[model samples]
Target chain A: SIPDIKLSSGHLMPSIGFGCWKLANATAGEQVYQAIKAGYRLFDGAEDYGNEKEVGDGVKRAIDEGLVKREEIFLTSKLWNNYHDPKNVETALNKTLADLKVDYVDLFLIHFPIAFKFVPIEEKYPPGFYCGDGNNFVYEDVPILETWKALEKLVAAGKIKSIGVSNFPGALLLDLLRGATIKPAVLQVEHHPYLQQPKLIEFAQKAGVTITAYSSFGPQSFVEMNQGRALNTPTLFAHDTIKAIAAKYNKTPAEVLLRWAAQRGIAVIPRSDLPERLVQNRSFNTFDLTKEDFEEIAKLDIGLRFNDPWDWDNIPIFV
Target chain B: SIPDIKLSSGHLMPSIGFGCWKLANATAGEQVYQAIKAGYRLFDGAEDYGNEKEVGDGVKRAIDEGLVKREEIFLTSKLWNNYHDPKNVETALNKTLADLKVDYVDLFLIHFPIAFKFVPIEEKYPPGFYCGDGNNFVYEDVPILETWKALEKLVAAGKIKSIGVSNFPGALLLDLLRGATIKPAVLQVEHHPYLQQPKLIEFAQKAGVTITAYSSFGPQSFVEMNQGRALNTPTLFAHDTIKAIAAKYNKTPAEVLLRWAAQRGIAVIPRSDLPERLVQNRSFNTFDLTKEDFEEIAKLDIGLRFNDPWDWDNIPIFV
Candidate 1:
């Protein structure tokens, strides 16, 4: 079992989780199964991923083989932008629950702070990026507090153990906290050495909110999406300094990256289908970088952000 | 008369204000005097500017001349980084009050989120950028909430009518709000067409926090400091599109920039030493830009921030 941190809500969250993004039906189940067998317990999924059914299948297989009990696993899903309306929040989560074949998830998160125009459930299931207008995204007039109030009802009803937010900027998060009856238990964001966000981390830690970092490998995650900035920038994996540190500890560069974040007491979710790499990632704490090494890594923060929605879809979610 | 905005504190703040940065003793009084006579009623100052005495003198002279009453004018100052310790919070503001020769200021702001090691008033009055090590900045251990609680005492003491913050990122601002008993009445930040923080502004407005924009001329303000990034970039005041719009409206480019900010319901603080420019800066709403023209200016947002402290003195405040 991985280490755990206590959230403000008094719940334990595994320090290392499995990222379920970009996992397709062709290979998602097997990858998830392999990850669990590799000692992973937390699977971070989202309604926008369009692979919850496969994720559910993998979980059921693991339980059938007696590899892990249902209660031992921690599952997380997100409320997509189209369902930001208070009335639609439960409907959206129910769809995810049905797809995942789970009665309740360990955590539920607002996928993005930007609310999009609602669409009928019959029109589309995930409704990935549909703007009512063909040319631009049509935004919903629903306030985040209204949707959060609805999420609060879900928590009281036992649909989710905890509620959180993802991809929300600090201002929006603060607004949510002010209006929320139940404070956010965690915040999920694209974090790496390059986009360190030291202030955000300091603020969250002080507020007793656990941070869950995604894209720990930095540009490598966005390069697959053909992001121009990510494609043009050098990958952190190949940086000479990272290579030197990895070699000193006899670890892979990927391990070095994940360990760097983990060392800061932040939870990391690094994904891989290859069994060897998954095992290597799971063994992050076997050897630690020296204090000097950690300081050197901290110097790499140049505020380079690769996963900003504003940069990709003109969403301006973080401006 | 300048238009006014109702702050969360239930006080009216002039929608257009005069930036008092870098204004020295050589002409500070005269410029301030001219601005007051020209109908500028709000003066934004800070202890870090090292010119609070001159600013106070200017205000005093204006009052002496009967151009504006002390109650009619809005005066603001900031608590510098070196005084972020809770023990030093009131001590710092008292120094500002002493310099301004006023019992109460209209607004007081936290200059930056980071706190620095305290320096004695005899050691260096303002202690602009003293890193305790004499090589780099030495940060204080005091939490922001602790310092803010100290500030709250001054509010109870009637030292300030409103409390605000400057140069804070969305995350830090949100964190401040969580622990604050008296909500911030204003948020001052570096903003321009090129660095439009739309999401931040949107969130602050929804929270009833009035935004005050700085660096309205963008690179023009930083070019004098030999900021390489600013020198290499085009000035927003002379941009072809802005100039075209200015020509169409028969107004100067400066007016167009300030007007654009004012049209968004944000307050602006643009500084100038020239008499005509000072008058023009205060006349932001003499004409209005069409919705099409406003959208044209909005499209110039390239997320270029010229005033980030992270670039200056190698402070990781925004990291």
Candidate 2:
């Protein structure tokens, strides 16, 4: 249903994938099932999403209905921050696997480069922002390399087909490239008209690593999180330039935005529950943006990033 | 002589090394020779400094007079920006080796994380900032992993006893650790009271990579470079707080400053033409700063960085 990009790990990844960030537990399976029916072959989920079981249920439903085979669909999950300690990595993956009821994930990424104080599985599964008092966040002493080495072990054991990273800054990614025997195949980061990190994208692509764009709609992803900057910023969907360009191309504003990034050879994972919107995003490759139009969209870069953990109660992870 | 810190390469480096940054061609040999006689055993030089022959001459002079043996000295040289191409790495080191008249340096470092277009040796030796037209700089596409793998080959070939990096931010340093087969033995950076970069120091130290502090006198080093911010900023030497701490400890402000970093287990490389200042800088271990004094100095971190290439005609190396 979608064209695939060959990863450095030699696996084929769909260029336009589905993001499962905010899927509700109750309807995640139904939405995921609908996503597959609408032609999404790559399902990007994470342990932190806390709805992998429902996501896996949709995949099983699609397979049972003779829609798509398990091997034909790509499933990705993320290792949570609390499991950065090598001892907890496999244990954390096992929980995700059991929840998803899957034998192996197509790709497993380190959710974030920052490591929080370890919380036992019994304490909480996702353990988001609870590693410290509501005021201060406790950081773990373990380095990222230790966690990556454990992921390498998982690859060797056939628990994961590929390893990738998300929300990693350029310097840390460069450092990881230097030490990793099994290189990271993909990097997923916040990308949109407002936050076009051209240099980071260039750096990763030059190293044969594919970049996946999350938050492709800019502040739309964080507006619901009560992010102040996101609330203050203008939404990309309603921008005059985007609307004019959408009219020019005779496509929806969403298609113009998705195509803008896809035209740059960047993989995009935009989540939408509406069947028509899902189909429209999945069909990003069906149309092409003019070079001038792409340059016009590029002009919107203001270097704003909304998903930084450092801004989360000033944890200083990026320091 | 200053005490040594055991590096990850299994070699011992003087905790207080001699910096050869601004040594004029007219007197570089004399300054280096004097530094050796004054009990400095580590000499940090780079191809960009354009005085490796003089540095080597001084080392030879010291050895001839029995001031020190080659085995007793820890010599470090660096690969310049132009030689980042893996193919040119060995050729660059061969030139440095010929200039230094040494079989192997105790340590070799990547001078910076950026790469510039290569210039031929016949066109220019040491090729300092001559990679492009004097007005604009051209960057090379060679990645750090390629350069690091080349350094690994040099280590195997016995041209360098250890490999290290300088001017790397924490994120890149973390990324390097992910891919590096032979971990960096040390990281040298511009460090002073104003740019303490405590997080970077903690990250590097936790990885067993010793941190080396260059330009320990803060704005003083950049003053000679005519950097406007450095000229406007008060020198750490003349700071009232540093002076008061020095008076309380009955030591010179230089010792107080050097010991402040050394006490935190960071290596210091302060340069001076005067033998007294040189000796004072080397004797950082002779005294200690109280915890309160260390904390007082720590509060001086203003996050100022003087050696950034971004400030140099918008090099965009760090972007």
Candidate 3:
């Protein structure tokens, strides 16, 4: 059994879970159902992931078969950049809920601390990286405060158990907290040994915000997308340090990566289409790296960010 | 005569200025007068700088001496962290105006993207880095939006010609732009070879915000403050790369620094206690770095930050 990490919302979530990014719609349902059977209580999905309906199908079937109840699972999804307008916030959340087949999500995050020009759901389903049909990237004049307050309203209405933000830097996070009616319960960001943010992680933990690490294998996903920056970087799975640590524990390098984050009080969502890898990821607490071992892994940090918005028309959000 | 940088507010400002960060109160007025005498048209001061009255005396003396007219000088002072409350914004500006003996300033900046607990002037003239008598450092619950709106009101009146921000990162600057009715005219930040923020500078340039580079000499100022990180780092003036560039231009290393930033379309504020250096600093446009030379200088950047807030009580503003 995985240990539980308590959110500021007083909700207990599994320290390890399955990420639903890049899941094929054809297999997302089956993959999620298989994950549930392997004791993945947390399912990290999002509107832009483009397979929420299939993910929901998997959750529903799992419930129907008595493998897991709705209450036994922690579902997380994100509000897209296009829905940053307060008027559009609920429309997006409702869409997520409808697709997930749930009345409420355990956690709802502002996908990124960015505001894209609004596009109606009827016009485009996911609106990934573009405002409209012209493939134009335009920014909408909506502050994070307006969008956050709307999330607070949803929390009040019980549509969301907890509200949070993703990809927000420390300054903006502090600024958000200054005006927020409710402190963000979790902060989701890209984190891996190669791009570890020790200072940000320490600050967020100090502020009582639970951290969720995405892309635990740095450059792995971005390489698949064929980003030039990621292509040049060495994959961490083949790194000597991680391999030695995994060998010491009789575990795989992938499991060592997830364990490192969980051991440092960070929750992780590792996606896998293979059930064997899913089982490997669930034993997050089975082995503990020595203090020296983790510190050695932290030395692998080179501060390379693969998910930088700066690469996209110079957004420079992570600068 | 110094060149002028056109601000987004449709105002023209000197591309080179004298920074008033650590000017001794006894000599500040004299230094400003000398700077004016040396053809400096811009004086960058702040309430936290603690020499505004002396700075004002120097400016007034220069005007009285017929060396310069008030309109010829571009004066910029910053609102302190403690004056972030909407109610205190005017009071802080008024104090600055009274100290500078000017009815209006060319530009004013929110000192940092930080809010400190408000303290009455009667209680403490400039409560710096502390909230009250206990030497306690407390963060006030005021958002940057509130302080900015107050500045906007000041602009609508005749007190401030333009408003801007200092020490703000890319995301928060973009976020500020989203909320601001009047876009920030200028942005001041630490910029040097060791901490060159090229992406941020490019983003601000694209957004039509004039960039003001401070601490152009990298670890020079922090070394004076006895910071350990600065102590270990090689001085830019001593570095072979900068020294060779200085030799190429037949200029001092300090002059090379100011020239490099100015050549990149960034305004610079370099402080000097000697009149000879003041004359050299004013020649921002006299020399140019070949494209290759400046690029080599930029290669010295290691993303080192000397003015990080995280060092003080975990305020991770620059993270």
- Best-fitting candidate, measured by lDDT? 3
* Model 3 lDDT, residue B64, Cα: 96
Candidate 1 stretches with Cα past 4 Å from truth are: B1-188, B191-212, B215-319
- Ten contiguous residues minimizing lDDT sum, candidate 1 chain A: A310-319
Candidate of highest TM-score: 3
Query: Which one wins on DockQ?
Result: 3
TM-score evaluated only on chain B, model 1: 0.96
lDDT of 2 at B259: 88
Please state the Cα-based DockQ of model 1 relative to the true two-chain complex: 0.11
lDDT tens digits, residue span A1-319, model 3: 6888888889898888899999999988998898888888899999999899999999999999999899999999999999999999999999999999899999999999899989999988899987874867988999999999999999999999988999999889999999998899999999999888898899899999999999998998988889898899988999999999989989889988988898889999987767677877777578889999988998999888989878777896887
Q: What is the lDDT, from 0 to 100, of the residue B192 in candidate 3? A: 93
C-alpha local distance difference test of each model: 0.83, 0.85, 0.90
Give TM-scores of chain A for all candidates: 0.96, 0.96, 0.97
Against the native complex, each candidate's DockQ, computed on alpha carbons, is: 0.11, 0.13, 0.86
For residues B186-291, what per-residue lDDT tens digits would candidate 3 score against the true structure?
9999999999989999999999999999999999999999999999999999999999988887889998888888888999999886777888888757777898
